[PDB]
Amino acid sequence: SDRVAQLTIGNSTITTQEAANIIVGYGEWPSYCSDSDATAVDKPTRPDVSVNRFYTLDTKLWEKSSKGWYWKFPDVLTETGVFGQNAQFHYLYRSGFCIHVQCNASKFHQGALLVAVLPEYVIGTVAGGTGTEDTHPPYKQTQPGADGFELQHPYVLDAGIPISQLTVCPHQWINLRTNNCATIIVPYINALPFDSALNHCNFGLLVVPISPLDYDQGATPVIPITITLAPMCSEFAGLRQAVTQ
């Protein structure tokens, strides 16, 4: 009754029989931009059901040696469905998100994934190892698209900060013996009412194994982790031709 759940939005429905409740980031639901917070004067387009629905974008294989991965929002969706088209044709964009990370195993497997949302997730480099080289991460690493990107040094989240404190951000854990999914709802987070879906990633989604996957020889060894997400209250403005970047 807290372990069972159904998420329906648009023409898509998700079910789970081993949930661990739902986290509503920073305690607030996504909402549209008010007339006093807004600044741009054109009437926005709010496509509703054609863009606020669940999109299943990627599947990673969890292995005994996996380090963890991250995806950037709204980057992961800029090239998918009607949402992507709207993000490309418009300068301004804003929306919340319902993130549903899936991973099931068996009552004989074990392991725990930390699933968290970190706003303004700026990536850093190892500065040439010695720290004397002022290198910078390449476009494919800051905005990895739907494939996401694997963490090089998970302990410092590839940004000089402790993953041990990542739980200060909206999160859930997928502890195989307990649940098979994580559900996090995130409201729009920015210091501006609207922004570019292309130039700015509002937050990053991190999926990192803290307690390594394990099982005995003979149990299914392929344990996928799938990422499904839905925009909520999407709004777009500043219409012109489509632009991919």
């Binding site: 009754s1 807290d2 069972v4 759940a5 159904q6 998420l7 409740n21």
Partner: protein, 50 residues
Amino acid sequence: GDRVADVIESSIGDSVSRALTHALPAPTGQNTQVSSHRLDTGKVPALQAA
């Protein structure tokens, strides 16, 4: 005449077949209601037990 309790409280002889269902008028196909997104735990329409 009857007297022992089990005979008095007996249901032997009930001729009215209790029906669990009943017919309803249905001259047209059912309508569709507006519905919105539901993001709940506990409520799970999609899951069945055939």
